[model samples]
Target: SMSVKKPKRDDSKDLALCSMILTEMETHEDAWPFLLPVNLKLVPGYKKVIKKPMDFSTIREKLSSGQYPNLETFALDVRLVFDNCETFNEDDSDIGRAGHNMRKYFEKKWTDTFK
Candidate 1:
């Protein structure tokens, strides 16, 4: 037989927990720009690793050649990569909105470059 024990609850602790969670969420969202490049670099086979062959250049060339594949996919990929870069400050009045605008800026630049 096992006895049930109620967990202790503290109002201050609950508040602190909520605040920390919110802060962490903001930090992660704000850090997206810094993390994007690193994440993109981690695409498998982009860099050589044990037992894996590196062929990113060849893949890039194939992607650039608009034959046998939808070029728009490549465009979207480029857009996503560019948009992930850090461009907004967390101190802004509307951090999320600013980040969205920054993403649009990158997307527009990519579209213009391709055009």
Candidate 2:
């Protein structure tokens, strides 16, 4: 039910991109329930951004503000889904696993970039 895509850059960038994507998705009210367990707090820094309502306009505003001080926080917000993978109920078409795998993929990509 999930698919992984290879990124064109290092893990941090990939994770950042993922965070952007997740932020985009979070804007939709429908995604809230599913994304609840992502642990945005563990994202290393800039926790306030993730906690806000995810919307393109808002994200764009934040980005434009040039206040992004923590890249790791941004990456982790998107990648933390992997750490809490099992918490997602399996009966929901295993979407949690999809998130997990995607997060894992990002983590591996991040590690490879640093190595």
Residue-by-residue lDDT tens digits, candidate 1, 7-111: 844333433333342234225444343232333266564344322221223224434453314445544443343243222224344644545654555455445
Model 1 misplacement above 4 A: 1-70, 78-95
Total backbone collisions, model 1: 2
TM-score of every model? 0.25, 0.38
- Stretches of candidate 2 above 4 Å error? 1-67, 81-86
* Span of 10 residues, lowest total lDDT, candidate 2: 49-58
lDDT of 2 by residue, 8-62 (tens): 5443454355455545555544443344433456644335533433323443444
Q: Which candidate leads the pack in TM-score? A: 2
RMSD of each: 19.2, 12.5
Q: What lDDT does the true structure give each of the candidates?
A: 0.39, 0.47
